[PDB]
Amino acid sequence: SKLIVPQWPQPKGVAACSSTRIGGVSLPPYDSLNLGAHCGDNPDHVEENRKRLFAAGNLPSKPVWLEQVHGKDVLKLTGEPYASKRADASYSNTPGTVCAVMTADALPVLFCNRAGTEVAAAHAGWRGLCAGVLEETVSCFADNPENILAWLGPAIGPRAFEVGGEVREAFMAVDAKASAAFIQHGDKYLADIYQLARQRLANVGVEQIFGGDRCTYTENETFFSYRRDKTTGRMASFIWLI
Ligand SMILES: CC(=O)N[C@H]1[C@@H](OP(=O)(O)OP(=O)(O)OC[C@H]2O[C@@H](n3ccc(=O)[nH]c3=O)[C@H](O)[C@@H]2O)O[C@H](CO)[C@@H](O)[C@@H]1O[C@H](C)C(=O)O
């Protein structure tokens, strides 16, 4: 349909979905289910696309949209309204509360515990992934990392994610083993954002990791991609306790 449903061993109390570009009202280059409000689209179309996602996903409440800044801060969803939503991840243990991250190449990661009593969503672009957003998201859970599941959503894969030293140096400063995930490609590198996520998740003891098969740049019928399109829309990934 419009929506991707993560293929992971989802506990009964957990629901998740990840949007695609299909099924909205936005015009090119935002065509069509653009959920992002700061990328130059018509605000009335973004509002309608967000309502369509709400209906298609059977969400129990409106998603808690974050003021994403490519950092490592996590908002605990203790109840609307919020003083500040300046964060790149959210955490919930409240039934019906919808965690949401907005992406167009950055890695969305969805998290839940085996008990299906706590969920989280993280926006892991290269800058936030390097800074520790995933480790910070795991640290918000009451449960131990051995009992946490992670789903790697659609991101820019290593076929397409060309980077320079701004990026490789940053990662090698935090954890030298990141070098494996950078492959020389002329004067630049191809970076494997899924590998870097798997490193950071293993570092905090998250072992049960799913997804990581999609490519936002390559699969242009399905996804917006900042790197491919420059001016483009945003998908989002969603998780909640039923
Ligand atoms: C995957 C990811 O983190 N993408 C993010 C990143 O874009 P990116 O595309 O990486 O741009 P760069 O940071 O400016 O550059 C990162 C590195 O990549 C080199 N490069 C860039 C372009 C190119 O063609 N070739 C090339 O080698 C460049 O020299 C630098 O070393 O930075 C943008 C903000 O500037 C974000 O909006 C974007 O977030 C997305 C939307 C989201 O939230 O989903």
Author numbering: 2 to 243
Article excerpt on this structure:
YfiH is a PG-editing factor whose absence causes misincorporation of l-Ser instead of l-Ala into peptide stems, but its mechanistic function is unknown. Here, we report the crystal structures of substrate-bound and product-bound YfiH, showing that YfiH is a cytoplasmic amidase that controls the incorporation of the correct amino acid to the nucleotide precursors by preferentially cleaving the nucleotide precursor by-product UDP–MurNAc–l-Ser. Our results show that YfiH forms an extended L-shaped binding groove for the UDP-MurNAc-monopeptide and is a cytoplasmic amidase specific for hydrolyzing UDP–MurNAc–l-Ser, a noncanonical reaction by-product from the MurC reaction. Our results showing YfiH as an l-Ser-specific UDP-MurNAc-monopeptide amidase therefore uncover a bacterial control mechanism to ensure only the presence of the specific amino acid in the peptide assembly pathways by removing unwanted UDP-MurNAc-monopeptide byproducts from the MurC reactions.
Serendipitously, the electron density map contained a prominent blob of well-resolved density for an endogenous compound, presumably copurified with YfiH-C107A and trapped during crystallogenesis. This compound was unambiguously identified as UDP-MurNAc based on its high-resolution map. The structure of UDP-MurNAc-bound E. coli YfiH adopts an overall globular structure that features a pair of two central β-sheets sandwiched by multiple α-helices, which is similar to the structures of Shigella flexneri YfiH and Geobacillus stearothermophilus YlmD (with root mean square difference [RMSD] values of 0.9 Å and 1.3 Å, respectively). UDP-MurNAc is bound to a preformed groove located on one side of the double β-sheets and at a distinct β-turn (aa 104 to 108). The aromatic ring of uracil packs against the side chain of Arg228 from H7, forming the turning point of the groove. The lactyl oxygens of MurNAc interact with His71 from L3 and His124, which forms a catalytic triad with Asp89 and Cys107.
